[PDB]
Amino acid sequence: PFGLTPKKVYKPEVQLRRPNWSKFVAEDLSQDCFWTKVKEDRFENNELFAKLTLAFSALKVLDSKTAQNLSIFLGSFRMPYQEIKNVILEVNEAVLTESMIQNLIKQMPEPEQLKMLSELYDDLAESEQFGVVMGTVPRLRPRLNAILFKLQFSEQVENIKPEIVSVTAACEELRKSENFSSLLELTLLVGNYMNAGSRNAGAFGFNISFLCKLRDTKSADQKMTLLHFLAELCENDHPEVLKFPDELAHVEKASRVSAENLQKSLDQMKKQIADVERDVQNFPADEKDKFVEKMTSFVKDAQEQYNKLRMMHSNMETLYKELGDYFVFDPKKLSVEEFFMDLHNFRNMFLQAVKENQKRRETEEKMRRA
Amino acid sequence: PFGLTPKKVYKPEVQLRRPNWSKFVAEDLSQDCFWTKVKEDRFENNELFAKLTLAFSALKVLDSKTAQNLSIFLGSFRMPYQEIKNVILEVNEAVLTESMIQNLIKQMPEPEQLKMLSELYDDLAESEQFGVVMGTVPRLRPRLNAILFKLQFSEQVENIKPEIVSVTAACEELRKSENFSSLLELTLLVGNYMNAGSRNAGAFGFNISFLCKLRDTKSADQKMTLLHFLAELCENDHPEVLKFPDELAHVEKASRVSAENLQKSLDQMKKQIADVERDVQNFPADEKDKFVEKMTSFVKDAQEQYNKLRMMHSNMETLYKELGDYFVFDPKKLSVEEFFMDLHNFRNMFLQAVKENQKRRETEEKMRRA
Amino acid sequence: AALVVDNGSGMCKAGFAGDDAPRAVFPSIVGRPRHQGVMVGMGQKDSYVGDEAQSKRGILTLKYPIEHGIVTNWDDMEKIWHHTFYNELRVAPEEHPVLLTEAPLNPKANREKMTQIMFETFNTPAMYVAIQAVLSLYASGRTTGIVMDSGDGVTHTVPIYEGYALPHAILRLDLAGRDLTDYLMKILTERGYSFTTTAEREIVRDIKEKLCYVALDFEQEMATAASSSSLEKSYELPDGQVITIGNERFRCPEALFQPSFLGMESAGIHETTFNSIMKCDVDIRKDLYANTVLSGGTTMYPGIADRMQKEITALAPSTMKIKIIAPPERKYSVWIGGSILASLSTFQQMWISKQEYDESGPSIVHRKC
Amino acid sequence: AALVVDNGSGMCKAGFAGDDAPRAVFPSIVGRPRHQGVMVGMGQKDSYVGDEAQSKRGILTLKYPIEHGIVTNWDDMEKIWHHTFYNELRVAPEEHPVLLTEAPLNPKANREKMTQIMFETFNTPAMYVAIQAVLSLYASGRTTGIVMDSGDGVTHTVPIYEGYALPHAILRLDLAGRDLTDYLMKILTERGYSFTTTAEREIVRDIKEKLCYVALDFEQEMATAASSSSLEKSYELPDGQVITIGNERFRCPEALFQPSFLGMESAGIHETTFNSIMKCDVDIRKDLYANTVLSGGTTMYPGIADRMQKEITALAPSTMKIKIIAPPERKYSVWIGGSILASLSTFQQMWISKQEYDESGPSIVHRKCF
Amino acid sequence: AALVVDNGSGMCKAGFAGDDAPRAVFPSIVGRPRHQGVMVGMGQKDSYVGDEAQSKRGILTLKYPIEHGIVTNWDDMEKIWHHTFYNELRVAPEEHPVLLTEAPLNPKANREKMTQIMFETFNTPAMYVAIQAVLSLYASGRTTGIVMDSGDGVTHTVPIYEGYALPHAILRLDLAGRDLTDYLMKILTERGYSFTTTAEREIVRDIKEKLCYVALDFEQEMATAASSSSLEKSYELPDGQVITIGNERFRCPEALFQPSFLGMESAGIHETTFNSIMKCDVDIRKDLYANTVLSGGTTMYPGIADRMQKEITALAPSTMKIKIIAPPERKYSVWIGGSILASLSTFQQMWISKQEYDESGPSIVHRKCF
Ligand SMILES: Nc1ncnc2c1ncn2[C@@H]1O[C@H](COP(=O)(O)OP(=O)(O)O)[C@@H](O)[C@H]1O
Ligand SMILES: Nc1ncnc2c1ncn2[C@@H]1O[C@H](COP(=O)(O)OP(=O)(O)O)[C@@H](O)[C@H]1O
Ligand SMILES: Nc1ncnc2c1ncn2[C@@H]1O[C@H](COP(=O)(O)OP(=O)(O)O)[C@@H](O)[C@H]1O
Ligand SMILES: [Mg+2]
Ligand SMILES: [Mg+2]
Ligand SMILES: [Mg+2]
């Protein structure tokens, strides 16, 4: 370029530390800048280099995703897989955990992949060698899927049963709630007085969820509210109706769930139990596999326990449809969530309505004393 | 139907707020449901309808925040606002202060709020009465804003001045620095020696800020450093290079401030005077207001003073871009703050590096004597 | 006419509402006789509180009822409050409401005790408690600024944005004036002068309050004193002797900025203002840097405002301006700031009435104030 | 004999590959004396690093070389590594490859610097750097999930997939142990106990690590604490004084879920896990939602699993299932995962060997270890 | 062989280095004859100093050159040193470095004048001023522990933690043995004796040295002593008369624990040590509460260790253990530590050599000394 590239061959005898600076190729600065005429000769000599060098003298079948993931999982627990193969075969509740096998079945490759491994030992990798061990067990895919039953079947019943028993308890409590009937009568008669001479004059009943819509109705003064008026009215001359929130205690548990969710969960459990019966017939029953009765006799108590989940959930349909006719609404346009969460919001809003009444009364008493 | 339709005629004397509910005709629920035998008579009476139809019969000028803040502020200086209004009208430099005027405009509400007070005296509070007196002055928002340039214009121009002269002097001082050139050559030659046979063999230049990275390079023995190597080498056989830090005396202030900050400040003050220019045209000129030449003639000297700042600010762009070309770096990826702070820190490193060389020599002399 | 009683660690202030330059100002000191009174004719009292105890400090003990803001002894403080209301002001507290001040970041027991005392022992119709530094801001006229207050034992830097403070960024330091006085008598011993008694403590406080200044550059000022005696001053003791102080004039004031001399790990009072800024919002820091108002008696050293501005600049980036305000009456900033509060008619609705206290007890203050 | 070192803001875990627990777990603090060594003979070694600083912390300046994940001092960091390799581990890195860990979203500058320190100061034959959050799942068995990583200075929720962290879904929260410890001092003053110096910081840390739990709810817990004194606990200082905390037990870790107490606008660690999930794909959302894995010592408060799960329920969809997983090895989770990774037979492939480091310089760490 | 000299307010101890014997010991008093000379045959000396002054105490007005540790007269103090180096030790200070001792918080003038007087008048090749209390800790062999050094004039405590002193927590009290001897005279007047001469002051010192003790409990002793003459240890005067001391055998040392007897407002020596530790850090208090060391002559009264231990535990934390160490040779603890300090090999580089004093002046003692 600009006659300024006399590259100096050095070739040090001993390798030195190499500082990494940002490279300046002789193009951007070569034209006209600083350092074009560096006097390298006035510094170059043989003593300095001798002194300077003194101080600074120096997987065959598995794909990419599963091969590393399987190797990681095997070292995660760090225990021989032959025993683990015995754990799943013998169903040892100690070593086996839910977390251990849920990601295990994810680690299983396609059922074909484990086949040639048995037909084809130390040369292969830790994931490949473990592939042979798991592939030996007949019907691998259904077997572990059969293992993920007692770790959930016992869990499913205890998770759902408080939800199942809470809905009916609220229904029976609401069935005998006389205070709710007294409160409902007050709104209907009072509401008909305001609706006279209109499209809703003399209405002999109204749809559910209207009680929470009473707050949206205001008065001549914005402070007063129609729902608050009922709260103020009852505390004056019609007591004993403020106890309806206490009459219902399982409001929050039942409203949080719906019968539709339980139907789907129960349907899946039927399918899960169906796989075992096919497995038992397909795989006849030993010493090698201690699962023997741990799964088929589990069904014997599972079917007994699953049976009790049918009639009681059937008691939901019998009681809710009767409750649906009680409030005049089919169990198709309105479900457990929509019907009851609306009522639960009414319970919270009624207590707040009577709370602001006490707060409003306190200011009234404060000014009367003053 | 099922004997459950005793339509109750009400005919209220005064129309009320009718609530809208879903209609429940007495054809579906009238067969066998709830609300067939509502005890309407048990709630029906004369007092309820009369009371119910009654409820549903179809610092003051300032807000909360400004009323107290203005009251606090008006009592802060505990002086009459009538003289304050005359003081701002006459622009009295004794009473008026930058702090006093800065938190004053914060206490003005929106310009609308000050209008109807004049049309609407002792009954109103001190905050409301203050607005009446202040609001009588036409063009309150601009005129109070019109005051607040000369109270700070002198302060801003005297602050930019040491920021600009220091950088330019630093640029000129570094331009003529031969010791900086002598030091730079030594790093390049020694660095090229060790970088031989690598990706940086025979480099004809390195980017700035690499000198501060020389300290990070160590040697065979951890006590011995490459940055200290140059200082040790310089003090032995290549003197007069140690004087480069003294050649640069305004780099610290040059490193403190950056051109980017200056450009924003310069742009802002250009808009400030422009407001006065629109003020002069919008408000033609006297005896009543002593503003007279305190602003229109202030701009004359302000524009004269401003023009000198534009040349001096432009003096960086002429100098720094040449400086940018001198060391090969565009003033877009690198600015005044980062480049000089890197060089400001490098000066500290070298003086410390030569300091530790003296300390090590002191121990070296101590053991030799012993 | 409401009252303001700004109790302080080392000295208290009192006066009516709608006023400045506090009227009843006397040190918060309580002393009891130490020797045996031979005379029978003299009417020697059990204890002397306030200005009376200072005049006769030769025989008294001069115990402080307040230390580092937190009240150590509550029996003697009831004497102080009774002394303030009856002798200094000559006002019956049963008819005029009383305002109080209190340091930020203090135990809830301390402020609860004042609530109890005023309502039954004194039976005040109403009472309120406000932070000290919040009073200090709008005593300067502004409403958005960091207040850095330094009294006897409390050095709190409270960033403020409006009529409401910012509790998140409130800092504190136990490096205030009282700690420096104990340091001054420690460095007076290298010159051969020994001060040990609590009576001789008040003497050292007056040496500091009159012959002490803050050096702009400590390193440079040390060479000037050692090279020549161009900074020496002489002070006269009450007995009659005169002592001379050299570099002790600026060494003890500067321990605020280098607390390593006192043996405390806490950073300097200059840095605790800078650190307290970074705990607030980035947008907020623009207004919080230009309004660094200084208050408190300890911030009255010559050159403290100049020294703080120089050191804050080094830490802060150059893009932000620094303005260290210093009102002329910064010693009584706390009192005057609370004085205008009772003047407002709007503040009447913000009272703690006796009926409210009766139905809630001393706990009412926490939810209200 | 691969070594694994996990550098952290609060502590550093070191040991050997293939082990189950770290060999040395000592605080990452460097302290120097502040007083004068009047005693002749002893009192030397002003650089106290590791456990020695903790024992003599009454006369030392405790300074953390790491703050908020980023290294604020690269001089004492070399000391800590030197102390770890030679004192705690007692091994020469000249023949032992070393694996390190890095924080999520680390700056590119910090990571490249660590390469130079390993390869020049210690000149290890090989070195690798891995993400801190990814190693949590390698230790937790599963290869897919979301790691709610926490610690002393950083809090990262990194929803990895197949062992590769998703970059766009990583959310960083500036709320970790150090802020919790600092918040404890501010709230402890309300009772009458003050801790200022860094020597007394360890006292507050020890109080936090023992007597603080996470309350499921506050609307009833606050009433319980004020009404009854059943929840008070007593701690003894090294001075021997007795302090009772009481109410402040649960208010220190609740800043994690309500950072508005500290004055920070960012939402809690419960809400950042939600938002980090939505940034991922819809199809993969099913697996990550139920596979949340905690990590870091900051997640060892009792009652953290049930609190987070309850809070994460309302924001989660009703059909969705949530399972917060708390392995017993939360404190050392990020170390054992590195032990699993290094022990693999396939880990030899991507070693950053010394021979290939010189050819590509320190920039090789950007294209080799990713 | 270095020379160790320990000049105290009431008695000097000077000997050689290495040897454990203080060698020559004599009081630090000087007396001038106040009686006229008559006999001329025998040679008459000038004002008497040393032990010879006590022999002829009946005619000389003995004067103490040192008062409260602070040298009040610099004329007589040089006389003692010549009496020390030449008459007693029979050594030439022309070739022997000399150690000096000085109480903490002493005026800078005294340590300056010690350097100036010795260098110009004795021309010793080296010098050092070392704190007495810190020097005494070498005799005990420990390295931590708050050291009480109650000499004849000064009572100071220095907390040392791991070799690093805490000058901010050094407490010095001007109440020691010399003040007690004046109190002994004040209480002897009550029974009916007189001691109002400086020649009778030494005799009263022997009343306190031999027949004084510190009661374990004090309020009960007055009840016991007044009721019955249990303790009436009698003493004979030098002339031949005999005296009887009752309850005043223990009241004299009681003022050390209740200085209100002397009228001083300072706290006792039991409260000062507790207050001194409270000024230290929380962590280091554990190694100081159980390591209280004693030294000096004033700490040789019977029951002083037991009385302090009971009083400290009345203020120390309940779980804290108080151990008042008191070696049997606490009288010479300062000197024995000096002999060990001088003979240390590493101590040879701390001497203030002759050349350094000339080029720095008398202020060098504030640089090479603590
Ligand atoms: N001129 C002065 N110089 C230095 N310090 C002063 C001065 N005036 C007062 N002080 C300090 O102010 C302290 C008390 O003042 P003040 O602020 O009223 O106390 P507090 O803030 O506790 O109410 C004293 O300890 C004194 O040291
Ligand atoms: N049992 C515990 N309860 C609450 N906090 C804890 C507990 N154990 C440790 N911590 C906090 O966690 C921090 C340790 O975090 P760590 O996981 O070591 O972070 P890193 O991985 O970055 O080193 C400590 O500073 C401590 O404050
Ligand atoms: N055996 C003893 N019993 C009681 N007091 C003693 C005894 N020996 C010395 N003292 C007291 O010690 C004081 C000074 O002795 P010493 O400690 O040797 O002086 P210094 O510390 O100045 O060298 C004297 O006032 C004396 O009262
Ligand atoms: Mg005050
Ligand atoms: Mg971690
Ligand atoms: Mg002695």
Short mmCIF file of N, CA and C in Angstrom, two decimals, chain C residues 234-302:
data_model
loop_
_atom_site.label_atom_id
_atom_site.label_comp_id
_atom_site.label_asym_id
_atom_site.label_seq_id
_atom_site.Cartn_x
_atom_site.Cartn_y
_atom_site.Cartn_z
N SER C 234 -6.85 30.91 70.30
CA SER C 234 -6.85 30.80 71.75
C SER C 234 -8.26 30.97 72.28
N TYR C 235 -8.62 30.13 73.25
CA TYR C 235 -9.93 30.19 73.88
C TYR C 235 -9.77 30.28 75.39
N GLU C 236 -10.68 31.00 76.03
CA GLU C 236 -10.62 31.25 77.47
C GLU C 236 -11.61 30.36 78.21
N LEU C 237 -11.13 29.70 79.25
CA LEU C 237 -11.97 28.85 80.07
C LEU C 237 -12.70 29.68 81.11
N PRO C 238 -13.83 29.18 81.63
CA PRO C 238 -14.57 29.96 82.64
C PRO C 238 -13.75 30.27 83.89
N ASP C 239 -12.82 29.40 84.27
CA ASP C 239 -11.99 29.69 85.44
C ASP C 239 -11.04 30.85 85.17
N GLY C 240 -10.51 30.95 83.95
CA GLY C 240 -9.63 32.04 83.61
C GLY C 240 -8.47 31.67 82.70
N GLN C 241 -8.12 30.38 82.67
CA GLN C 241 -7.01 29.95 81.83
C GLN C 241 -7.40 30.02 80.35
N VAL C 242 -6.38 30.03 79.50
CA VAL C 242 -6.56 30.11 78.05
C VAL C 242 -5.79 28.96 77.41
N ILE C 243 -6.46 28.24 76.51
CA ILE C 243 -5.85 27.14 75.79
C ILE C 243 -5.77 27.50 74.31
N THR C 244 -4.85 26.85 73.61
CA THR C 244 -4.63 27.08 72.19
C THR C 244 -4.84 25.78 71.43
N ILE C 245 -5.57 25.85 70.32
CA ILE C 245 -5.85 24.70 69.48
C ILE C 245 -5.27 24.97 68.10
N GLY C 246 -4.53 23.99 67.57
CA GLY C 246 -3.93 24.12 66.26
C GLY C 246 -4.75 23.44 65.19
N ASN C 247 -4.31 22.26 64.75
CA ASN C 247 -5.03 21.50 63.74
C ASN C 247 -6.26 20.79 64.30
N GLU C 248 -6.54 20.95 65.60
CA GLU C 248 -7.77 20.41 66.16
C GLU C 248 -9.00 21.20 65.75
N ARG C 249 -8.83 22.36 65.12
CA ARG C 249 -9.98 23.17 64.73
C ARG C 249 -10.77 22.51 63.61
N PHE C 250 -10.09 21.89 62.65
CA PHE C 250 -10.76 21.26 61.52
C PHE C 250 -10.74 19.74 61.55
N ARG C 251 -9.97 19.13 62.45
CA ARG C 251 -9.91 17.67 62.48
C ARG C 251 -11.21 17.07 62.99
N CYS C 252 -11.77 17.63 64.06
CA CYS C 252 -12.99 17.05 64.61
C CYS C 252 -14.23 17.34 63.76
N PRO C 253 -14.38 18.50 63.11
CA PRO C 253 -15.53 18.65 62.20
C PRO C 253 -15.48 17.70 61.02
N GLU C 254 -14.29 17.34 60.54
CA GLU C 254 -14.19 16.54 59.33
C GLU C 254 -14.42 15.06 59.55
N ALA C 255 -14.50 14.60 60.80
CA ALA C 255 -14.78 13.19 61.04
C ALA C 255 -16.12 12.77 60.47
N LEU C 256 -16.99 13.74 60.17
CA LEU C 256 -18.21 13.43 59.43
C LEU C 256 -17.89 12.86 58.06
N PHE C 257 -16.91 13.44 57.36
CA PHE C 257 -16.59 13.02 56.01
C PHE C 257 -15.62 11.86 55.94
N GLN C 258 -14.88 11.58 57.02
CA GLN C 258 -14.03 10.40 57.12
C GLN C 258 -14.26 9.76 58.49
N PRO C 259 -15.31 8.95 58.63
CA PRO C 259 -15.62 8.35 59.93
C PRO C 259 -14.65 7.26 60.35
N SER C 260 -13.65 6.93 59.53
CA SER C 260 -12.67 5.93 59.94
C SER C 260 -11.84 6.40 61.13
N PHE C 261 -11.76 7.71 61.36
CA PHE C 261 -11.05 8.22 62.53
C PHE C 261 -11.77 7.84 63.81
N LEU C 262 -13.10 7.88 63.80
CA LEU C 262 -13.89 7.48 64.96
C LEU C 262 -13.99 5.97 65.12
N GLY C 263 -13.46 5.20 64.17
CA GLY C 263 -13.51 3.76 64.26
C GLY C 263 -14.82 3.13 63.85
N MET C 264 -15.59 3.80 63.00
CA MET C 264 -16.87 3.29 62.53
C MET C 264 -16.78 2.94 61.05
N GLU C 265 -17.36 1.79 60.69
CA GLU C 265 -17.34 1.33 59.30
C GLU C 265 -18.25 2.16 58.41
N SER C 266 -19.18 2.92 58.98
CA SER C 266 -20.16 3.65 58.19
C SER C 266 -19.47 4.66 57.28
N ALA C 267 -20.03 4.83 56.08
CA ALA C 267 -19.48 5.76 55.11
C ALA C 267 -19.73 7.20 55.56
N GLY C 268 -19.01 8.12 54.91
CA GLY C 268 -19.09 9.51 55.31
C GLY C 268 -20.46 10.12 55.07
N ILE C 269 -20.71 11.21 55.78
CA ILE C 269 -21.98 11.92 55.64
C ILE C 269 -22.13 12.50 54.24
N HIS C 270 -21.03 12.75 53.54
CA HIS C 270 -21.13 13.15 52.14
C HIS C 270 -21.62 12.00 51.27
N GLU C 271 -21.14 10.78 51.55
CA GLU C 271 -21.51 9.63 50.75
C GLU C 271 -22.92 9.13 51.06
N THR C 272 -23.36 9.24 52.32
CA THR C 272 -24.70 8.78 52.67
C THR C 272 -25.78 9.62 52.01
N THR C 273 -25.47 10.85 51.60
CA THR C 273 -26.41 11.62 50.79
C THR C 273 -26.41 11.14 49.34
N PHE C 274 -25.24 10.79 48.82
CA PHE C 274 -25.15 10.27 47.46
C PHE C 274 -25.78 8.89 47.34
N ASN C 275 -25.53 8.01 48.32
CA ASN C 275 -26.12 6.68 48.29
C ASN C 275 -27.63 6.74 48.46
N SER C 276 -28.12 7.66 49.30
CA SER C 276 -29.56 7.78 49.49
C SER C 276 -30.26 8.26 48.23
N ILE C 277 -29.53 8.93 47.33
CA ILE C 277 -30.13 9.37 46.07
C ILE C 277 -30.37 8.18 45.15
N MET C 278 -29.39 7.27 45.05
CA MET C 278 -29.49 6.15 44.13
C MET C 278 -30.56 5.14 44.52
N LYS C 279 -31.12 5.24 45.73
CA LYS C 279 -32.22 4.36 46.11
C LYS C 279 -33.56 4.83 45.58
N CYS C 280 -33.63 6.00 44.96
CA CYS C 280 -34.86 6.52 44.39
C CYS C 280 -34.91 6.26 42.89
N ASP C 281 -35.98 6.72 42.26
CA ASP C 281 -36.18 6.50 40.83
C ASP C 281 -35.20 7.33 40.01
N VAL C 282 -34.91 6.85 38.80
CA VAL C 282 -33.96 7.54 37.93
C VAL C 282 -34.54 8.87 37.44
N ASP C 283 -35.83 8.89 37.12
CA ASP C 283 -36.48 10.15 36.76
C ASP C 283 -36.44 11.13 37.92
N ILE C 284 -36.61 10.62 39.14
CA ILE C 284 -36.75 11.47 40.31
C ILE C 284 -35.45 12.19 40.65
N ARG C 285 -34.31 11.60 40.29
CA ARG C 285 -33.01 12.11 40.71
C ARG C 285 -32.70 13.50 40.16
N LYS C 286 -33.37 13.90 39.07
CA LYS C 286 -33.13 15.23 38.51
C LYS C 286 -33.50 16.32 39.50
N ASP C 287 -34.69 16.22 40.09
CA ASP C 287 -35.13 17.21 41.06
C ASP C 287 -34.48 17.01 42.42
N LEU C 288 -34.07 15.78 42.73
CA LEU C 288 -33.50 15.48 44.04
C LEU C 288 -32.04 15.87 44.17
N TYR C 289 -31.36 16.18 43.07
CA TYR C 289 -29.96 16.59 43.12
C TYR C 289 -29.78 18.09 43.26
N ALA C 290 -30.71 18.90 42.75
CA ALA C 290 -30.58 20.34 42.77
C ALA C 290 -31.15 20.98 44.03
N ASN C 291 -31.75 20.20 44.92
CA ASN C 291 -32.41 20.72 46.11
C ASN C 291 -31.90 20.03 47.36
N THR C 292 -30.58 19.86 47.47
CA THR C 292 -29.97 19.18 48.62
C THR C 292 -29.86 20.16 49.79
N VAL C 293 -31.01 20.47 50.39
CA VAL C 293 -31.05 21.41 51.50
C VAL C 293 -30.44 20.77 52.74
N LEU C 294 -29.59 21.53 53.43
CA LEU C 294 -28.95 21.09 54.66
C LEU C 294 -29.64 21.75 55.85
N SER C 295 -29.90 20.97 56.90
CA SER C 295 -30.51 21.47 58.12
C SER C 295 -29.79 20.87 59.32
N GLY C 296 -30.19 21.32 60.50
CA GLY C 296 -29.60 20.81 61.73
C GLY C 296 -28.41 21.62 62.19
N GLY C 297 -28.22 21.65 63.51
CA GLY C 297 -27.16 22.46 64.08
C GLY C 297 -25.77 22.02 63.69
N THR C 298 -25.55 20.71 63.56
CA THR C 298 -24.24 20.20 63.20
C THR C 298 -23.80 20.64 61.81
N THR C 299 -24.73 21.03 60.95
CA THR C 299 -24.41 21.48 59.60
C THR C 299 -24.12 22.98 59.54
N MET C 300 -23.68 23.58 60.65
CA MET C 300 -23.38 25.00 60.70
C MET C 300 -21.88 25.28 60.79
N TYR C 301 -21.04 24.30 60.46
CA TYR C 301 -19.61 24.56 60.40
C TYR C 301 -19.29 25.48 59.23
N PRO C 302 -18.30 26.36 59.38
CA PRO C 302 -17.86 27.19 58.25
C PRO C 302 -17.24 26.32 57.17
#
